[PDB]
């Protein structure tokens with residue numbers, strides 16, 4: 297049972313993770329065959345957080361790369377491909393300073409080239425890449441690309457695919473198979489996988505990741521209220537204004553330090569979040585928001601990353617159902633109305649992120665209902681999960697599959713034309 301391995305470093309805005317994948321040498325073009333073998337969480341921030349100290353970006357990777365030498369057998373190092381892909385942290389740094397961006401990419405490249413893996417490059421993914429590759433990960437792992445049935449009796453229509461919603465720290469993606477006509481080339485994706493054509497919609501909303509949304513709501517609370525209606529009553533902190541306004545995401549919203557306190561006001565919080573979504577103009581037949589084309593959502597979806605972490609909080613810590621859009625809205629209201637002592641009574645251990653759940657839950661409720669136009673019928677088809685077949689869901693597996701060429705466009709010998 298001879299195995300091959302492959303490695304991806306996912307260099308997100310808030311963290312870097314390393315995934316090591318393994319697969320049998322001679323079944324390697326089978327769908328769903330590649331699985332996660334191990335992973336590692338790099339300590340500290342994302343590589344973009346070393347914008348002004350680029351050499352620390354390369355050093356941040358060492359510990360996880362030392363784990364990869366132990367995870368992958370030594371005789372396979374030389375032939376195990378290694379990739380780094382970076383997402384919206386580096387896309388935002390690139391708007392601010394393409395030179396500092398280059399110096400960070402150079403430092404991670406220098407570090408990664410000292411290791412004995414087959415290093416295939418450090419790249420910034422486009423928004424489209426990031427959305428499509430997570431869609432391919434989820435569907436590959438759940439075996440949605442198998443042609444179901446047998447000769448003389450193929451299931452029709454073919455097996456549906458799972459849409460993907462990824463809430464990262466600095467951008468959010470929505471990607472799904474659609475029968476609707478394309479109206480914007482930047483959203484239009486055509487894939488050829490195991491002999492089949494998939495027509496796909498994708499969009500990445502830069503600045504609509506969790507950390508950037510929190511920063512925009514804070515900038516907005518500062519300007520409109522001088523209290524934060526999404527923060528819990530009893531919670532307060534010293535806000536450093538230069539950190540609030542240095543993001544490309546908040547420059548458009550412009551004393552070194554101001555005290556700001558929560559007020560547990562679910563209604564004002566909802567009003568605050570609503571201003572994130574411009575619904576006033578659409579140059580297409582229909583839009584999601586901000587003038588962006590989007591056909592009707594359809595089919596099942598998996599919502600992972602911060603959709604999952606936030607729903608996990610509402611169900612596991614607050615003990616509240618989130619099965620319907622109306623329950624998610626009630627759960628957000630109850631969470632937002634909690635005072636800071638009440639929220640802390642529920643969380644015996646570390647309290648990081650605790651003051652932010654109200655704002656994040658509220659954004660997610662609005663994003664799904666107002667931004668993407670899910671309703672009770674389509675929302676019922678959404679599941680919140682972060683893992684499929686023992687593999688973390690994300691873009692890293694899909695990316696690895698594509699660059700290593702492990703998903704054939706067509707089946708061998710076209711399977712004798714038996715799927716025509």
Ligand SMILES: O=c1ccn([C@@H]2O[C@H](COP(=O)(O)OP(=O)(O)NP(=O)(O)O)[C@@H](O)[C@H]2O)c(=O)[nH]1
Pocket residue numbers: 307308309310311342383384385463464465466467468505506507601602605649
């Ligand atoms: O366990 C966790 C880990 C991360 N998070 C937060 O979820 C958000 C999304 O995390 P992520 O690792 O999917 O984002 P990312 O760093 O890959 N950011 P991007 O994908 O480059 O935009 C972040 O704000 C992170 O702080 C949790 O809430 N709980």
Ligand SMILES: [Ca+2]
Pocket residue numbers: 308309383464465
């Ligand atoms: Ca990410």
